[PDB]
Structure 1
Amino acid sequence: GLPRRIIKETQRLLAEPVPGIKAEPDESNARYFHVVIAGPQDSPFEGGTFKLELFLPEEYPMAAPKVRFMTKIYHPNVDKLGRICLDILKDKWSPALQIRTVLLSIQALLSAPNPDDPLANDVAEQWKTNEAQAIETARAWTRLYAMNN
């Protein structure tokens, strides 16, 4: 079957939920996780919902979950291919952390509009030189992409 760390973490993640976030395992693969994060209060992504894909590697929890955005989003932390730039998914991962940690942290990049952004994207520099124009763009992209069916 599975290692106990996944079995338990699933059970706990289903019987307790996280406010603002739907997160349920794939019916065919227990290591595959489909996630909808609903865009948070008073942030450019207000009123939109964003699908995400989380996967737990073989060596987990000794290495971070793999996480990617499906829903297209104007953000200095998330690029064209949906890849998430987050510290606890690379350098600052600890086996003491869990999926709930990944989710909250990602959410708080929007929540909690994380600027972020002392890094160098084409989006980040736009957010650097002027908050004004950039914040509106992300409101527009929420409109175009994050909704609805």
Structure 2
Amino acid sequence: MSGIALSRLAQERKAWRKDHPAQFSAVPTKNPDGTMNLMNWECAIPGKKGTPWEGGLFKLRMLFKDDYPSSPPKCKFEPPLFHPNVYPSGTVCLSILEEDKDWRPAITIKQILLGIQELLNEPNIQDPKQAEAYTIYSQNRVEYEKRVRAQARKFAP
């Protein structure tokens, strides 16, 4: 693990604790010995006002590899949720954290977390990463909305 990644993650943790959006969570994971590893994190994203996902608090794990910040972190919701852009193994994909499109080493934890939040608020069709949620959201909107509400109550705080 590169020392640059460690120092950068420490700076990100300090910045996030100093300033972060309300009722958001982003902390390093409790190691089995009791410490926290800054290279692998637990995060939880609340819903947005008036949105179908409002009220839910969706847990998300993100993985930092040794190439950070040159490489983006790999995020994943635990447990996986019913959204078109998330692989039902839990991992999520967007241009914000993908190398070849937009991943900039200078970006911080807060903005990528906001990106995942707005991605959840913006289920897209042009880049499907899952089948069931994609087809339901494309064809039967009301069942998709009902399932989104069920998920929101499922991951309520």
Gaps of 5+ in 1: none
Q: In the alignment, residue 16 of structure 2 is paired with which amino acid?
A: L
Q: Are 2:106 and 1:103 aligned?
A: no
- Counterpart CA distance in 2 for 1:18 and 1:48 is 16
Output the TM-score relative to the length of structure 2: 0.80
| Residue aligned with 1:93, SS | coil
Q: How much has 1:132 moved relative to structure 2?
A: 2.5
Q: Are 2:33 and 1:40 aligned?
A: no
1:101-129 deviation digits (Å, cap 9, x = unpaired): 2101001123xx20222134331122122
The answer on whether the counterparts of 1:65 and 1:99 sit within 8 Å (CA) in structure 2 is no
Q: How many aligned positions are there?
A: 145
- Counterpart CA distance in 2 for 1:62 and 1:44 is 35
| Residue aligned with 2:66, SS | coil
Q: Are 2:15 and 1:7 aligned?
A: no
Q: How much has 1:84 moved relative to structure 2?
A: 0.3
Out of 56, 64, 67, the residue aligned to residue 72 of structure 2 is: 64
Out of 23, 28, 40, the residue aligned to residue 26 of structure 2 is: 23
- Counterpart CA distance in 2 for 1:12 and 1:31 is 16
Gaps of 5+ in 2: 30-34
Out of 134, 151, 154, the residue aligned to residue 141 of structure 1 is: 151
Q: How much has 1:79 moved relative to structure 2?
A: 2.9
The answer on whether the counterparts of 2:56 and 2:151 sit within 8 Å (CA) in structure 1 is no
| Residue aligned with 1:109, SS | helix
- Counterpart CA distance in 2 for 1:42 and 1:117 is 22
The answer on whether the counterparts of 1:14 and 1:24 sit within 8 Å (CA) in structure 2 is no
- Counterpart CA distance in 2 for 1:108 and 1:19 is 15
- Counterpart CA distance in 1 for 2:133 and 2:78 is 18
Output the TM-score relative to the length of structure 1: 0.84
